[PDB]
Assembly symmetry: D2
Homo-oligomer: 257 residues x 4
């Protein structure tokens, strides 16, 4: 209740899923939290539920929405300590020949450039507070995924950008880290499974992709985020895996001819 | 002279620098090579110099240029075995607050989406030949660089996209790999150093960034590319480092307070 | 004060340096801690200083010492939740031709096999408590170090062993993770610098090896350990870097000839 | 036939499997090859089959055997350009509680210290020739394997040691690299499968662990070794994956509870 007391945190895509788990974790740590989301439904309810959280409608692909998000955070709370860039999307499975440069550009706008834009607008305030940035990437940026060329590319970009910005902001004492989740049970995971030929089989495969034999929870990503913000003062430019071991060992990915 | 005989290779940005080194390596291996570049000067001279290389003017950011590049390669040579996505650029050093979303989008168009577009248009022919794709990324996609947030992001994207496409194309026997060079002495390296406060000091730092104590050569990247195309039949989705050891050991990157 | 209340932790090499920082972090989290060390001086004083910590003399290279460490922990505290394998040593800088297979074997006994032996003897109790293992490796296991072939080899082994054991123990709900510190200011760091030609220059180089421009503290490694034990329930087989960014970017590691 | 003409190569464990594939690749490149093996059967036959290869009986765990291997190579061929440290073994699958420190020490002697000892004794001659070292590690050193704690640890050590030695030998122009194979169809692979409950199922799982849907061949590891020796003059301290993509994507490794 006191690990991050007195601090102000912005969480993008905080209305449901991982983002909402991160919001809850920071509120439980004593922080005040600004929930940013393009959708009113979940975020507005979260603001009613949690003292110390408020909701600001903001589409991170719209630069003026994001400018207003930062200026309202400062006007209302007087400081900014941490930005969590969680807003993002995974398209349906798409073979490479089924993708388009147009769709790729649109996914870059959300998953990469929205993270860039909020970070840029927040850094003057983060420098004053010696605050930090936490980007939500994905394990598949590191190891790849089938039927997801644009999505994987955007997450490889986020992870790399995290390291570049960590170098640039280190002289100011501003840390920049990312979390790479694996399979986390969220509304997005459920939506994707529901469009599959056999949703139940997809969910079962998703559980068995981890040595731990289950999917992760938003609360687990949230705890990792609170650690990076509040207790990781010698960590910058790291990729914190929250994956249940999915990257470990040999598995089913498809005698020497 | 026979390691890649009978094969047809397209090299983007092949008019100078690393690209020209890759062109020369493939010609020396027995391949026919299509040199793609947006600039006529170097590529046209290379086509006169090298029997078995021809030049096609093509800006990889223009989708119809790239469509014509593929259709002319097939019309003239009857097959396509390997695409080397080398065209790319490094902006001047830029602090994060000095970058723009606009500039970031333009760099994504070249370094990421041009690679995507040629690969997409070539894959139907690569499937017929069980050919392969080689993307030229950078070590800094993996470890970061100072004053280069957009560039680093684009190269993290390329490396990740390589792994995603390797998964997707593996059932067809089409391999997709990347090379991550470190400091290679090229016209781009020289141009960047020339705008620095002390160009000679920048060049010396560039040499000493490798344990080997020198920069790499285009011919060395070219040899790695010929290996991946011609003799690496069980390699897919790898990142081949051609860096002189720059990523190894502790160095000068800036007692416990 | 309650994050790890009711839990029992064993920390090897806990008498000074990183180990003592880890001991303090777990006591502050509410745990009872068994301090293991081959040296009485620091550990005995820590047991007097910290309610909830006790000292057991134990050389982790002696299998019967370690058997007694586990049996006494169970006899005295009734359970075992976490083992932190921190005991280890760095030899003086040694050129490869100055090392011996004999010295290499002795360093393997401490840095690798002592970690193996305590882990093996503790796992039956960790399975009962769904506890976890935390190994202290090093960044140089991942990126190398000059004049340290045996030390680097032992830390590459620890990091890899962590992943293997994470796979094996995942069906039992026992997580196995490691922390890879970079330059942490400890008595061992000070001892090594003191034998150098210019100790002050070595210390300054050590600070500048991180983009953050300082060395890390034992308390920072300790906070990472408490996170892994208490709040990282979907993390297994990870390597948590506590390095200040030392692995990021180009540096001084030693134009193309 | 000329890529490595005039050069002298030592391959340990060269009598069968990957080692024999490496021997053949270097002979085909124009090199003279010394086949080292503890077993006479395969190596002696290879020496009769291949002009330019000779067999020397040598157990790499016996330091005086290795001293004689180097001194006889120099006496017979007058120079030494490349050492390939391939000799190694994989124990049967063993749960952690079924391993012993004794067995772990014995596996370290072969897989780690034999590589160390030959490298040490060869480096004075490699410095004279600006030669290179190639260590055969394993993908599982990087990602782990189930039921193989000692084996995984030894391969993590080899990969890390490669980077340390690359740093140390870089001032002399001696490169040190490793190859990490995945599933390669060899007599050792066949022996391990034969002791499994269902050998045919194990072999099928082994093929499907790669996106390419087959196991690799010794000849493919051999081609990678010839590349590193003969054409990778700016590569030092790299880990060259020859794995068929086994490390890519999600797989079967075992909804959020
Ligand atoms: N669920 C997983 O398994 C998983 C794994 C790895 C990474 N991730 C990443 O975690 C993040 C959250 O994923 P999730 O599964 O919780 O997704 P989700 O779809 O359940 O939640 C995403 C939230 O972000 C909001 N959002 C979307 N576009 C936005 C925009 N333009 N502006 C503002 N808010 C926007 C949505 O409205 C929603 O409330 C994403 O970046 C995703 O790539 C998820
Ligand atoms: N030089 C290095 O140290 C280094 C290091 C790592 C990665 N790289 C990468 O290697 C690649 C080549 O770099 P370089 O140093 O040889 O650069 P360069 O500038 O010397 O050569 C690049 C070539 O690509 C061409 N090109 C640029 N934009 C193009 C476009 N839109 N369409 C077609 N051709 C285009 C240029 O005209 C030029 O001939 C780039 O992807 C770069 O990011 C270089
Ligand atoms: N200090 C750094 O920069 C750094 C960096 C990376 C990793 N590490 C690792 O962190 C760990 C602790 O390092 P440190 O700098 O605190 O060292 P230290 O020498 O200051 O402390 C090590 C402690 O372990 C004890 N110890 C040594 N051998 C032992 C044995 N056989 N049995 C029991 N206890 C034993 C010592 O007596 C001492 O109290 C080591 O594993 C080291 O490799 C340290
Ligand atoms: N086969 C795979 O899938 C695979 C995968 C990754 C790594 N590797 C590694 O590749 C190497 C070769 O493996 P393989 O499958 O060809 O094995 P193998 O058992 O088929 O061949 C190993 C050879 O080394 C020899 N050897 C063993 N101990 C020796 C010693 N003390 N001194 C000298 N020679 C000795 C054996 O007699 C044999 O001829 C090993 O290091 C192994 O760990 C193999
Ligand atoms: O790993 C991630 O970062 C991620 C994020 C959100 C949802 C999912 C998800 C959830 C459910 C199915 C799939 C799926 C299945 C096959 C191909 C493919 O392309 C995607 N993917 C993953
Ligand atoms: O590492 C690469 O992929 C790369 C590619 C081409 C040129 C250079 C280069 C060449 C010369 C200087 C710099 C430089 C220096 C300081 C900051 C910065 O941002 C870039 N960078 C690198
Ligand atoms: O990075 C580590 O895990 C580590 C751990 C403890 C101490 C030191 C240290 C401390 C001081 C000097 C050196 C040093 C300097 C040159 C060569 C060399 O071989 C070691 N090394 C590192
Ligand atoms: O990946 C390697 O470096 C390797 C090397 C040689 C043989 C095999 C192999 C060959 C056949 C089975 C297994 C196996 C199966 C289950 C558990 C286990 O522990 C090992 N392992 C792997
Ligand atoms: O929709 C799947 C899951 O999404 C998570 O974000 C929610 O916290 C869970 O209650 C829900 O079961
Ligand atoms: O301009 C720097 C270097 O660029 C390379 O691409 C050329 O091959 C060299 O001849 C030249 O010195
Ligand atoms: O000896 C160097 C440092 O070692 C650390 O373990 C101690 O906590 C510090 O007080 C000390 O300055
Ligand atoms: O024993 C399995 C395989 O081992 C390889 O080393 C040989 O080259 C193959 O002929 C054989 O089928
Ligand atoms: Na509220
Ligand atoms: Na020509
Ligand atoms: Na006490
Ligand atoms: Na012969």
């Amino acid at each position: 209740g006191t690990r991050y007391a007195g601090k102000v945190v912005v969480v993008t895509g905080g209305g449901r899923g991982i983002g909402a788990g991160i919001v809850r974790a920071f509120v439980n740590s004593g922080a005040r939290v600004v929930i940013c989301d393009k959708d009113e439904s979940g975020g507005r309810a979260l603001e009613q539920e949690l003292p110390g959280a408020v909701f600001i409608l903001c589409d991170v692909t719209q630069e003026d929405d994001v400018k207003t998000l930062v200026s309202e955070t400062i006007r209302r709370f007087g400081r900014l300590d941490c930005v969590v860039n969680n807003a993002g999307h995974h398209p349906p499975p798409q073979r490479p020949e089924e993708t388009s440069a147009q769709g790729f550009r649109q996914l870059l706008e959300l998953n990469l450039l929205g993270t860039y834009t909020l970070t840029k607008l927040a850094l003057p305030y983060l420098r004053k507070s010696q605050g930090n940035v936490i980007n939500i990437s994905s394990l598949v940026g590191a190891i790849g995924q089938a039927q997801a060329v644009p999505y994987v590319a955007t997450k490889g970009a986020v992870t790399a950008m995290t390291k570049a910005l960590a170098l640039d902001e280190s002289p100011y004492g501003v840390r920049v880290n990312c979390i790479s989740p694996g399979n986390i049970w969220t509304p997005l995971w459920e939506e994707l499974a529901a469009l599959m030929p056999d949703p139940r089989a997809t969910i079962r495969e998703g559980m068995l992709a981890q040595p731990l034999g289950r999917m992760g929870q938003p609360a687990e990503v949230g705890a990792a985020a609170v650690f990076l913000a509040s207790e990781a003062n010698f960590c910058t430019g790291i990729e914190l895996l929250v994956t249940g071991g999915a990257e470990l060992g040999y598995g089913c990915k498809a005698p020497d001819i």
